[PDB]
Amino acid sequence: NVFQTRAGCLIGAEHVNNSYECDIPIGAGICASYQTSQSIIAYTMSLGAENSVAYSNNSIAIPTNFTISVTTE
């Protein structure tokens, strides 16, 4: 399977029309992954979950609980 990326010709990876988090970075917004009989797919990067914050001129969101998260660096 032949796909034409702006980074070059990609052979062996089918070009799906979906969008996922970048698994293997190809370039020019295209990232490849191993997903569904499973194959290697080449998609456009999904920058994140599409969500609009319910903004309003008289609406505020205030947390009621919390999480003490210990990240590592």
Partner: protein, 319 residues
């Protein structure tokens, strides 16, 4: 204005130093692991610049959107929010920054000089910028430290006034004046970038230095370095293999070291851009995703809040 990314160049000795010269090729492999090292050095830079962009802009894993009706108590973000009309989903300021930064890269590309495209193409870099903008207006300083909690933008600004020791009543009485000052200041930024082009010199110099180093790396193949000639098929067509061996070797060591210097300059340049990208990432974390008390960090004055803007190979903060 802060440089963030650099042109992801990638050399190939076995075509740069000499193309269609097998005798030079095995002479190269006699030198050893110089060139697997250089491709390693430059792919290390190229991954680094992909990671520079990925850490300045991808501070959010959620892509936020401003409400379709854009009222914010009088603040006019139309000059920084992306245009739904233009094909490129960039703000007029983003558009202005792009038109103020200037095929020539393909020229060096012809000479064994690949220019890998950045992983985050400029339209998705603009999406991060739009996401950071939409989060900063709708949520404020909160979406960068957990969930996106909506808040009236004037209420958020009133809090940011409280952050600088000015009680929020000052805003609510002067909200119309603040909004008018805010919109006027944004408009002046548009004019300032339009009128004064050198404004983006910090970005243009980076691009210029990239081309200059690439330009120099191409002008070196036109130097015989003390050999009979600079062209290799010339030396191979008018000298014997055991005789041209010395002249071929002279061009190899000369071209190889010129490659060594450019890689060294790129490593210096990548380190400088790494420092600027880390500074840009820090400013995005503190100036944009929050409200920093660090004096003169996020602009001259008491920092209220900031706006990122994607620019070619860099980011522009409106403090």
């Amino acid at each position: 204005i802060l440089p963030v990314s650099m042109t992801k160049t990638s050399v190939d000795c076995t075509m740069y130093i000499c193309g269609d010269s097998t005798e030079c090729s095995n002479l190269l492999l006699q030198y050893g692991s110089f060139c697997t090292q250089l491709n390693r050095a430059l792919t290390g830079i190229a991954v680094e610049q992909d990671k520079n962009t990925q850490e300045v802009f991808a501070q959010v894993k959620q892509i936020y959107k401003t409400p379709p009706i854009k009222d914010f108590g009088g603040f006019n973000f139309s000059q920084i929010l992306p245009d739904p009309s233009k094909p490129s989903k960039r703000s007029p300021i983003e558009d202005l920054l792009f038109n103020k930064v200037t095929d020539l890269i393909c020229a060096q590309k012809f000479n064994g000089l690949t220019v890998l495209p950045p992983l985050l193409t400029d339209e998705m870099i603009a999406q991060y910028t739009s996401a950071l903008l939409a989060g900063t207006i709708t949520s404020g300083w909160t979406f960068g430290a957990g969930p996106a909690l909506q808040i009236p933008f004037p209420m958020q600004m009133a809090y940011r006034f409280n952050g600088i020791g000015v009680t929020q009543n000052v805003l609510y009485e002067n909200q119309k004046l603040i909004a008018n000052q805010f919109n006027s200041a944004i408009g002046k930024i548009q004019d300032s970038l339009s009128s004064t082009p050198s404004a983006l010199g910090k970005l243009q110099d980076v691009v210029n230095q990239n081309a200059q180093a690439l330009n120099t790396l191409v002008k070196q193949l036109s130097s015989n370095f003390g050999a009979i000639s600079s062209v290799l098929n010339d030396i191979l067509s008018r000298l014997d293999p055991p005789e041209a061996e010395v002249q071929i070797d002279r061009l190899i060591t000369g071209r190889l070291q010129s490659l060594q210097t450019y890689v060294t300059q790129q490593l210096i340049r990548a380190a400088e851009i790494r420092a600027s990208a880390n500074l840009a990432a820090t400013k995005m974390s503190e100036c944009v995703l929050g409200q920093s008390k660090r004096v003169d960090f996020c602009g001259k004055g008491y920092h209220l809040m900031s706006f990122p803007q994607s620019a070619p190979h860099g980011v522009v903060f409106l403090h």
